[PDB]
């Protein structure tokens, strides 16, 4: 554990808190870098010299995910080949391995780093090569394979109809449309679950979803991706005597006006839209 007997270091990527198949994995890339440990000095238990790692020969490496990946396919890997480095002699060459901070909305990128000790011996026929690679969490003495853990947030949207006024028709059915738009990280034809009462429905990103609400009724999407846009529209707004007003409330914040059919970007605050249809 944490000791590889070749010249390759395996680096894994995980999302420990991603367990719900209904949730969409963001289409995203994770970038890993190997740096010299410039503070490396001294000697090992058997007297071997500890030296800063040589990075010429190494490059940044990427692990990619798509919306098709699910909790069961969430662990991926890349391999850094230290045999591409020219070592000038016997020694322990010490590196630091890390994940770059990306820029995708909703994603938390692992900040932990790993100490990687490459034990270099004589190569048959001349010169030198890695014999063992030892990895540990930086600031620890525990041998452990290199693993970076990311997470991503989901959010929600609820849309409710209230019909008000003296002559508001308390069983009239208002037509609504919900459209989720594609983004860089969430693509067309991916599914998000919508709940109306005790029934579940599938909404496809990029296809307007038609539904109906009477007074008191709502739809909700509990596991919406972060960083997409949506539009909510009510087809008969301000018709048949009705004064229609729509509001948006985010988390425990203050309600503000929501313009029917206007794009709203999803972020880390839960959204609730109330459409009031008043008739005095
Ligand atoms: Ca929000």
**C-alpha of residue 33 to centroid of ligand 1, in Å:** 34
Phi, psi angle pair for 66, to nearest 5°: -120, 170
Which of 135, 153, 171 lies at the terminal end of a domain, its last residue?
153
| Total tally of structural domains belonging to the chain | 2
223, 202 contact by CB (below 8 A): no
**C-alpha of residue 48 to centroid of ligand 1, in Å:** 56
Q: Which residues contact 243 (CB under 8 A, 6 or more apart)?
A: 165, 276, 277, 278, 279
Residues flagged as binding site for Ca(2+) = 250, 267, 269, 271
**C-alpha of residue 259 to centroid of ligand 1, in Å:** 15
CA 116 → CA 13, 57, 181, distances in Å? 17, 16, 43
CA distance 25 to 250: 23
CA 162 → CA 71, 152, 168, 173, distances in Å? 38, 34, 10, 11
Which of 92, 125, 153 lies at the terminal end of a domain, its last residue?
153
User: How far from chain centre, in Å, is Cα 135?
Assistant: 26
3-state secondary structure of 197: coil
**C-alpha of residue 104 to centroid of ligand 1, in Å:** 16
**C-alpha of residue 70 to centroid of ligand 1, in Å:** 24
3-state secondary structure of 119: strand
Domain CATH number, residue 175? 2.60.40.1140
Domain CATH number, residue 53? 2.60.40.3050
Question: Reading across the β-sheet that carries 146-149, which strands appear in turn?
Answer: 76-81, 8-14, 146-149
Quoted resolution (Å): 1.8
**C-alpha of residue 12 to centroid of ligand 1, in Å:** 32
39, 61 contact by CB (below 8 A): no
Say whether both 31 and 112 belong to one domain.
yes
**C-alpha of residue 81 to centroid of ligand 1, in Å:** 43
Say whether both 218 and 88 belong to one domain.
no
- The domain of 51 spans 6-153
Say whether both 143 and 245 belong to one domain.
no
Say whether both 186 and 265 belong to one domain.
yes
Q: Read out DSSP for 32-72? A: EEEEE-TT--SB-TT-PBEEEPP-BTB--EEEEE-TT--GG
3-state secondary structure of 260: coil
Residue 177 placed within a domain:
yes
CA distance 221 to 186: 16
Say whether both 178 and 63 belong to one domain.
no
3-state secondary structure of 83: helix
Bridge partners, residue 210, by sequence = 177
Bridge partners, residue 274, by sequence = 160, 247
3-state secondary structure of 73: helix
CA dihedral 113, 119, 123, 129 (to 10 degrees): 10
Residue 1 placed within a domain:
no
∠ CA 16-18-20, rounded to 5° = 145
CA dihedral for 179, 183, 187, 188, sign (positive or negative): positive
**C-alpha of residue 271 to centroid of ligand 1, in Å:** 5
Which of 33, 40, 277 lies closest to 176, judged by CA?
277
Say whether both 147 and 46 belong to one domain.
yes
257, 142 contact by CB (below 8 A): no
CA 29 → CA 67, 68, 225, distances in Å? 12, 14, 17
Count other Cβ atoms within 10 Å, centred on residue 46. 5
Bridge partners, residue 11, by sequence = 78, 146
C-alpha radius of gyration, the chain, whole number: 27
Say whether both 11 and 120 belong to one domain.
yes
Residues flagged as binding site = 250, 267, 269, 271
Which of 153, 187, 202 lies at the terminal end of a domain, its last residue?
153
Say whether both 148 and 247 belong to one domain.
no
Q: Which residues contact 177 (CB under 8 A, 6 or more apart)?
A: 208, 209, 210, 211, 231, 232, 233, 235
Say whether both 181 and 241 belong to one domain.
yes
Say whether both 148 and 163 belong to one domain.
no
Say whether both 178 and 52 belong to one domain.
no
Residue 141 placed within a domain:
yes
């Amino acid at each position: 554990a944490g000791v590889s007997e070749n010249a390759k270091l395996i680096v894994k990527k995980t999302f420990d808190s991603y367990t719900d198949n209904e949730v969409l994995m963001p289409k995203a890339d994770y970038t890993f870098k190997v740096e010299a440990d410039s503070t490396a000095s001294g000697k090992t238990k058997d007297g071997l010299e500890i030296k800063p790692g040589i990075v010429n020969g190494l490059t940044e490496q990427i692990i990619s995910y798509t919306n098709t990946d699910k909790p069961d396919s969430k662990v991926k890997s890349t391999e850094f080949d230290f045999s591409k480095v020219v070592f000038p002699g016997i020694g322990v060459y010490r590196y630091i391995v890390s994940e770059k901070q990306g820029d995708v909305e909703g994603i938390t990128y692992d900040t932990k780093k790993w100490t990687v000790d490459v034990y270099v011996g004589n190569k048959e026929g001349g010169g030198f090569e890695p014999k063992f690679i030892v990895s540990k969490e930086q600031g620890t003495d525990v041998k452990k394979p290199v693993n970076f853990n990311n997470s991503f947030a989901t959010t929600s949207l609820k849309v409710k109809k209230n019909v008000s006024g003296n002559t508001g028709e308390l069983q009239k059915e208002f037509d609504f449309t919900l459209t989720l738009n594609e983004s860089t990280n969430f693509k067309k034809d991916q599914i998000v679950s919508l709940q109306k009462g005790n029934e579940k429905f599938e909404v496809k990103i990029g296809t307007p979803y038609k539904f109906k609400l009477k007074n008191g009724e709502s739809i909700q999407l509990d596991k919406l991706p972060v960083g997409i846009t949506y539009k909510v529209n009510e087809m008969e707004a301000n018709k048949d005597g009705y004064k229609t007003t729509a509001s948006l409330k985010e988390g425990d914040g203050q309600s503000k006006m929501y313009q029917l059919d206007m794009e709203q970007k999803t972020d880390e605050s839960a959204d609730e839209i109330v459409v009031t249809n008043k008739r005095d």
